[PDB]
């Protein structure tokens, strides 16, 4: 890999973040990016629940 790395950089001046399948007849996804989005969305949702736990009022904006 390093020999390709040296060749690319001297021309210019992480393949483990992609899951790739076998072509029976190719990049399939982004495990790092997909999990982060799926984890952050439930993180803010958890934040909303901890804000909603002990409240009874609320601004009712009908505009």
């Amino acid at each position: 890999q390093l020999k390709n790395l040296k060749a690319a950089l001297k021309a210019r001046g992480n393949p483990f973040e992609i899951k790739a399948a076998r072509n029976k007849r190719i990049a399939v996804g982004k495990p790092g990016i997909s999990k982060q989005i799926g984890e952050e969305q439930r993180k803010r949702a958890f934040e909303a629940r901890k804000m909603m736990k002990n409240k009874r009022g609320g601004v009712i904006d009908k505009r």
């Binding site: 890999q1 790395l5 393949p15 899951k19 790739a20 190719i26």
Partner: protein, 282 residues
């Protein structure tokens, strides 16, 4: 050989038991040395010990790596055999090859019908220094045990988030130089013990310009293992992952070879104690 190995263990065990008793004596000698240098009065128990003061004349001329590794640390390169469980799947065989490439002096051995006592006894004859045995679950590596010969220790790890190199397209062949090693966030005595076990699977004295680096990063008792190839640029360093990726969590450490189920346990993971999740041991 069998008789020789037996007595070497009895002598070693006896030495440990005596050293624990002698630890108090060593502290007492330290107090006398400090008292003589500082000039401060000696405590009452030590003041009245005539035997200790007489011995101190001989013991005045008295002055690291773990004892199992101290004999060969930095002299003889390790010899490693990487094997698996009986009837391994295709992926475990591939993973065992990946672990073989990780350690420069590793040799992969097929475990067809080999019984555990014969495996270690055969390894001890051939001069093997470590034995690595891998387990799986439906072609997913789950556990990794490392047994150091001739008398231990045996450390068992559980592997999570394993990403093999065969899962990559056009990855290419690895470089097999003696790699640089990074051990980060290993603070407790157990961490120092774990580091010593893992450090001695690699050869001593990598070249300063070696272009392969293996890092073990401790993050809440989950040791991330990554392999990178770096190039020193004019304004910094650029690294690229070679793999595989996986996180090992120690859950047992025994004072003996992996055959010995009766070996004294140096450390074990207590999962059901009340305050288990509070503290991180490593």
């Amino acid at each position: 050989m069998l008789r020789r190995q037996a007595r070497e263990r009895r002598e070693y065990l006896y030495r440990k038991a005596q050293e624990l008793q002698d630890s108090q004596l060593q502290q007492k000698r330290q107090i006398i040395k400090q008292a003589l240098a500082q000039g401060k009065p000696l405590p009452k128990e030590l003041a009245e010990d005539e035997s200790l003061q007489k011995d101190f004349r001989y013991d005045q001329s008295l002055k690291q790596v773990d004892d199992e590794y101290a004999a060969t640390s930095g002299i003889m390169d390790p010899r490693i055999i990487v094997t698996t469980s009986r009837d391994p799947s295709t992926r475990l065989s591939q993973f065992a090859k990946e672990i073989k490439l990780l350690f420069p002096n590793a040799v992969r051995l097929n475990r067809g019908n080999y019984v555990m006592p014969n495996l270690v006894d055969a390894c001890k004859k051939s001069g093997t220094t470590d034995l690595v045995v891998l387990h799986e679950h439906r072609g997913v590596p789950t556990s990794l045990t490392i047994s150091h010969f001739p008398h231990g220790p045996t450390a068992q790890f559980s592997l999570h988030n394993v990403v093999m190199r065969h899962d990559i397209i056009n990855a290419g062949n690895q470089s097999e130089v003696n790699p640089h090693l990074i051990f980060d966030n290993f603070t407790t005595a157990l961490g120092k013990r774990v580091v010593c076990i893992l450090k001695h699977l690699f050869n001593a004295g990598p070249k300063k310009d070696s272009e392969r680096v293996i890092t073990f990063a401790n993050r809440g008792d989950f040791i991330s293992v990554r392999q990178h190839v770096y190039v020193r640029t004019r304004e910094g360093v650029e690294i690229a992952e070679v793999g595989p990726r996986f996180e090992m969590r120690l859950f047992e450490l025994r004072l003996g070879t992996l055959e010995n189920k009766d070996a004294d346990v140096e450390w074990q993971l207590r999962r059901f104690i009340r305050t288990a999740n509070k503290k991180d041991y490593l």
